[PDB]
C-alpha cells in the first residue's frame, strides 16, 4: 500500500574500548543524535510519531528504557511510542527495519530509528547478590564477554570465526590484508574528509574546558602489514587464524536516521537521500553465525527485484575479517564496493549501534559517487543474518 | 497486509518474587512455553519462519540472545530468525505484535511471539567494576527496581500511580475493592479450572523428591479488605492511598502465542483461537504512564472501526488498583468484563512475559465465553500504553 | 614487681552462623559485654585505663577501631587506650593477656581485656574494585573461608586437622563421640543453669517486640551416635576421618573481663575469681597448628612452678575433636576436667572471641567446683597456640 | 623489666598510592623488611622468639595471619609465636612496644615489631553477598576511607584537623609552610643520602624490563607555597584551612626493627643503636584525635623522668599540619628539631607500617647526629596518641 524514505541520517564517532567516549552514557550519544538528525531533517519533534534504538548491554537502568530516552531527552515528543530492540550485532538495522515497518503499515508516517552501544561502560553482574552467597568464593560476571560468546555452545564469536575461515578457506592472509584495507579506507577516508557531515561531534565538557570527540579513533593510519602479522591467534591455541589485528573493535557508538512516508517528504518538500527497497533476515548456524548476511542478502535481493552487480555501494559488517572475507566471495561481490571506507575492523563494532552506523555510512556514500542502488547487511551472534537496500532518491 | 491468527497460546503459571520459579532462568522458561504452545497447534520446529520475543531485564549473558534461546532449546529451526524486543512492561504485546507485523507483511505465515521474565533472578549490577572505583564508596544497583523506576524522575511506578489516582480521583477504597476483585475471581478462576487448559507445567525434579508448578500461587485465596484497609500507603510521603496491597506484584513467567496467516493457518485444518484485528499504540506522560492503555486503545478501536460497547471480553493489565481503574473510568468500561479472571495484583506482573501473559488470558477466556471481540492493553513505564483486538476464529 | 586479677567476666551466649546473632555487629556484642562486666565488677569506665579485644574478620570499617569502639560504646572514657588485636583462633586470650601485660608493667591498674566475632557477617571482598577488571570475569572472595585457610599452604584448617589425627593417630571414633560428648556436657550444662550468670542476653528488637537471646544454640540435645556417624569427612576424598559433626561451628560471640592489680581490687574490697599465675606461646607447625595448645600449655606450667594434675579446671579449645583429643593425649589430661560443659564443637567457634570466651567459661566453672588452679589453651590458624593459667582467689 | 635494645631497624621506601608499590602485598613487603632488618642484626631466622606487626586494612585473606607471614616467608623459624595488631595509625609502634613488652616480661629475648599497609590495594566489601541483599540497591564499601574515618562521628580525620587547627589557632599558612618544610626537609634528606641506610630496594622484575624502588616518591621536591596557596580546603564547607596539599597521603609501606635484650644484645657482639627507655598512651577526644601525642608524651617523658628540653631527635608523626604544629604548640618543640627530614605530608603515611616507619627514620637519625634521647610519637583514630622514647647504644 505505502512508501518510506530517509530525510536524514547521522551518528557520533566511534569510540575505542575505553576510550574517549567511556564516560558518555547510550542513554547520551543517543538523545544527541536523534537531536541532530532531526535539524538536518529540518523536522520537530514534535512530528515524529515512532522511535526504535538498538542496544544489547544494559550499562544501567535507563538503558531498559532507553529508547524512550533517547527519543525524549532529544526532543520527540512524549506523545511518541518508543521501543528499545534487540538482535545483538544487527540491532541497529533491525531498529531502522522496526522504524520502517511501522510507517509501511500506517502506524504512522514519520520514524526515526537508531542505536547506541558503549562497551566501555558494560558492566559486570553480581549473580548472587540478591538471595546471597551463603559461602564459598563468588562471581563477578563481564556482560560485555557476555555478549560476545555464544548461548548455546558457551563459545566466542570469535571461535566461530574460525569455522567459517576454514568452512571457505579464507587463509590467514585474506584476513590480515583485509584488515590493513580497512584500516588504508578508513584512514584514506578520514583525512579525505569524507565523514564530516554525517558525524555529530561529542562536546564534552572536562577540565582545560571542554574536549569534543569527533573523528573515529580506531583506525590506525601507520597501517603497516608487518605490523599486523606480528599478531598470534587469540581464539585457539593450535590452527589459529583469527586475531585482535583482524577482528572486530570493541567500541562505543550512536547512529540515527530520520524516516519519512514518501508523500510526507514531498508535502514536506524534503529531499530524501533514498527509499527504502526491501529487507530479509535469516537465521544460519550458530556455529557460524558469521554467513548470516550472505543467506539474508539472497533473500533481500529477491524482493526487490534486483540482482547483485546492481550494487553501486555496500555495507556489510566486518565482525571479523575471517567472515567479511567469506561473505564477500560467496556473495561474488567486488572488493572496493564492499565497505569503500572500511568497517568494524577499523573504525570499531559498538555492537547495537553498528547497524545503524553502517547505514549512516552508507546512504552518505551513495551521495558522494551518486550511484542508485545500496546494501547493509551483517552477521548477528547467535546464528542470525539481516540486511535492507536503499535507492538513491 | 492479508490476516493474521493465533492458532494457539500457553504460559506458565506464574511464579512470586522468589518462589516456585526462584531456581528458572528466562531462556529455560521461554523455551518450555514455545515447546509447548508450538505442540497445542501441531506445528513443527522447522516450520516456524520468525521468532520475537518481549523481555526487560537481562539475568545473564543468554537473556541477551533470549528470543533466540527461547526458540532453539524449545526445538525451534535454526533458519528462523529470532529477535528480543523491550518495552517495558508492554514487551510482552510488543512481541506478538511485531511477529504479527512479519506475517502481515509476509516475511513469513509461521511466526510466534512471546514474552519472558524472572524478576527473582533479576541482577545486581557493579558499575564501578570495569574501571575500577578508585575511591570511595560504591554501588551494586538493583536491577528490578531499576526496570522499575521511571528513567526521567527516577521515582517508582507507585508513585506515578498516586498521580494517576489524584488526577482521576480513585480513591484507598475502590482500589481496595478491586483489588479484592481481581482476588476473588483469580481464586475463583482457577477453582473453575479455566487455566489448566492454558498453562503448561513446569518440572523441576528436587533430589530427594521432584516438584511441578502449574497453579498462579500469587493468588490470595481466603484474603479480604480487612487486609487492604490494613496496610499504610507505601510509596508517598502524604496523601497517600496506594500499597503493596493494592499494588501489582513482582513475578517470574513465559508465554507464547503461536501465529499465523489467515491462509496457512486455514490450509493446515486448523482451528484458530481468534484472529489479529488490529493494534494501537500510544505516548503518554511518564508521570502518569498508568493512563496509556486509554489513549492506545481508543486508536485501536479507531483503525478497527469498533467501539468500547462492542467487545465481549477485556484484559487491561493492572499494574495497580489506581490506574487500572482510572483506564476504565474514563472508558466507562464494563467492570464485570474487565479482568473477568483477575490481574497483576492477583496473578501478578513479571512484566516482560505479560503482554503475552494476558493475551492468552484473553483469547482462551473467549472461547470459555464464545464472545467475538476482546481486548488486550497495558500501561507501560516511561509514559506509554499498548492495544490490540482481536476476534474469533 | 606487680600483680593481676579478674574481678568480673562475662559474655554473650554463642549464635550459630547466620541465627539469631546474624544482625548483630561485633562492635554492638561487643559494647555490650564490656557494659556487663563493669556492672558485675561494680566499676565505672571513668576507672578504666586500657582495653584490649580480639577479633579476626572485619565485617565493616568499624572493627578496623573495634576495640575503642567497644569500649566507648560500654561506657570506657574516651580518655581511655584501646587496642585491637589478632592471633587468630588464639585473639580472645591473646587480648586477655595484653590487658594483662599493661597492668604488669604498671601502664595502669585497671584492665579490660575481651572479644568479638561475627562470622554470619563475615563479608566478600572485591579485589578488583578499585582499579578495575578491563576484561573477564571476576570475584568475590569470601573472607570467612580466608580466614579459615592456612596462608601459606592455602589449605583449610580440617585439611590440618587429619594430620594430627593421624600424627597421633586419633581416630575417627574418638572424634565422634568426643563430639557427642561435648553437646552432651553442654546440654545438660545448659540445663543444669550453669551459665546463666556468665551470660548478657541480646535484647534486640524485633518485630512482635523484642527478642531475646540468651541461651547458646549451637549445642544439640537429642545427641545421637548414628545422628553424627552418619556424617562423611568433609576435607579430604579419600582416608577422611573430620566431619561436620566432630568439627567447630562457625558462629557469633562476644566476651569480656573486667582486671585489677590486686591492691585495687583490696583497695575496692572486691572478691576477684582468680589472679594470673602465668601464660605461654608457641608457633607450631602449620601443617598441625592443631597442637599449639600442647607445647603453649607445657611452657605456661613451667613459669608458674607447676605442673600437670594440679588442674582442677580446663578449658582448652575444641577447634576440632581430631585436635582436642589430640592435645588431651600429649598432655596426659583427665577427660572430664577438660571442657566438662563442651566446647568449640558443642557451643560453637567464634574464632577471635573464643579465647575471651572459655576464659569467662572457665573461671565461672571454679567457681562452681571451688578448685585453686585453672587452664585455658588453643591452637591457633597459622602454626600458633596459647595458655594461660589461673588461680582461684 | 631489664632493658630492651633495638639492633638494626630497616624499612621500604614508601609507595604512593597506586604508585611503586600497587601491585605488592603486605605479607610480600613484611617478609621482606624481616629478612633484610634480621640480616642487619646478623641473627638466624631460628633465633627469633617473638613477632609482632602493626596493620589495619586487610587486603587479601593472608593479611589475616599478617605477622605470621611477614615472619616464615622472611626466614623467621615456625617455633616463634607472631601476632598482629591493631591500633590504626599507631599499629607501628604498638608492634614495637607490645614486642618490647615480651622481653621486659621475658618470654623471650629475641623478638622483632613491624608495620605493614598497603593503602594501594585496600579491598572494598560487599556487606550484602553473604546473605543477599533482597531488593534495593546496596554497597560495596570502601575499606581504605573505612580506615580513615572515625568509627563515632563518620566523619573524615581531615574533619577532626579543622577542629584541632581551631582549638589551638594554626592557619593555612602555617600549615601550607609547615608542608612545605617537610618537602624540603625529605627532598633534602633523600639527596644527603640519609635514606639509603635503612630502606631496603623492592626488586619486582617485570617482563621486558624488571624494576627496583628504592626511594620515597611521594616527595614533592622543586615545589612550593604556591602550591599549598593554591588548593582549596577540601574536608569541610566553611571556613577550611586544610586540604591535600598540607595534608598526610595515602600509601604503601612496611618497616621492622629486632629487638634484644641488653644481655643478649651484648652477650652476641652486637653494637645497638638504641636503647629503650619508655613508652606512653593516651586516650583522647575523637573529634581532636591530633593531640594524642601531646597527652600520651607527656606520660612517657614522665615514666622515664626526662623533659622535652632534654630530647635531641624528633619523629611524631604528621598526619597533618594543622594537629603537628598543634602538637609542637602544646609541647614549645624545637621545630628545626622535629621531623627532621619531613613526614607523612613528605615521605607519607600507610598507617600500619608509620610507627614502625618514624621510628627507624628515628634510631638511624640519631646515629648521624650522635645525639642521645629520642622521640617517637604519633596520633590516632578514633582518639588517641602513643610515644616512646629511647636512648643512643
Known amino acids: 500500500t505505502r512508501e518510506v524514505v530517509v530525510v536524514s541520517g547521522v551518528r557520533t564517532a566511534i569510540g575505542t574500548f575505553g576510550g574517549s567516549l567511556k564516560d558518555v552514557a547510550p542513554a547520551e550519544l543517543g538523545a544527541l543524535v536523534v537531536r541532530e538528525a532531526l535539524a538536518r531533517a529540518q523536522v520537530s519533534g514534535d512530528d515524529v510519531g515512532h522511535v526504535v534504538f538498538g542496544n544489547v548491554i544494559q550499562t544501567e537502568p535507563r538503558d531498559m528504557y532507553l529508547g524512550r530516552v533517547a527519543a525524549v531527552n532529544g526532543g520527540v515528543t512524549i506523545n511518541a511510542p518508543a521501543l528499545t530492540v534487540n538482535r545483538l550485532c544487527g540491532s541497529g538495522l533491525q531498529a531502522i527495519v522496526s522504524a520502517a515497518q511501522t510507517i509501511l503499515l500506517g502506524d504512522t508516517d514519520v520514524a526515526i530509528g537508531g542505536g547506541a552501544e558503549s562497551m566501555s561502560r558494560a558492566p559486570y553482574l553480581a549473580p548472587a547478590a540478591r538471595w546471597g552467597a551463603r559461602m564459598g568464593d563468588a562471581g563477578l560476571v563481564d556482560m560485555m564477554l557476555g555478549a560476545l560468546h555464544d548461548p548455546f555452545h558457551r563459545i566466542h564469536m570469535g571461535v566461530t570465526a574460525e569455522n567459517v575461515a576454514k568452512e571457505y578457506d579464507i587463509s590467514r592472509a585474506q584476513q590480515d590484508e583485509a584488515a590493513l584495507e580497512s584500516h588504508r579506507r578508513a584512514s584514506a577516508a578520514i583525512k579525505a574528509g569524507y565523514f564530516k557531515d554525517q558525524i555529530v561531534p561529542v562536546v564534552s565538557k572536562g577540565r582545560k574546558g571542554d574536549v569534543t570527540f569527533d573523528t573515529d579513533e580506531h583506525v590506525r593510519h601507520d597501517a603497516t602489514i608487518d605490523d599486523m602479522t606480528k599478531l ?162
Open 232 to 393: 598470534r591467534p587469540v581464539f585457539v591455541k593450535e590452527n589459529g587464524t583469527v586475531t585482535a589485528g583482524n577482528a572486530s573493535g570493541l567500541n562505543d557508538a550512536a547512529a540515527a536516521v530520520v524516516m519519512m512516508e514518501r508523500a510526507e517528504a514531498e508535502r514536506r518538500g524534503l529531499k530524501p537521500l533514498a527509499r527504502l527497497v526491501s529487507y530479509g533476515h535469516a537465521g544460519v548456524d550458530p556455529k557460524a553465525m558469521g554467513i548470516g548476511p550472505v543467506p539474508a542478502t539472497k533473500i533481500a535481493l529477491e524482493r526487490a527485484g534486483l540482482q547483485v552487480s546492481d550494487l553501486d555501494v555496500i555495507e556489510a559488517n566486518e565482525a571479523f575479517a575471517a567472515q567479511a572475507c567469506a561473505v564477500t566471495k560467496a556473495l561474488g561481490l567486488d572488493p572496493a564496493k564492499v565497505n569503500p571506507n572500511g568497517s568494524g575492523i577499523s573504525l570499531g563494532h559498538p555492537i547495537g549501534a553498528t547497524g545503524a552506523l553502517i547505514t549512516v555510512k552508507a546512504l552518505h556514500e551513495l551521495n558522494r559517487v551518486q550511484g542508485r542502488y545500496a546494501l547493509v547487511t551483517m552477521c548477528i551472534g547467535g546464528g542470525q543474518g539481516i540486511a535492507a537496500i536503499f535507492e538513491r532518491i
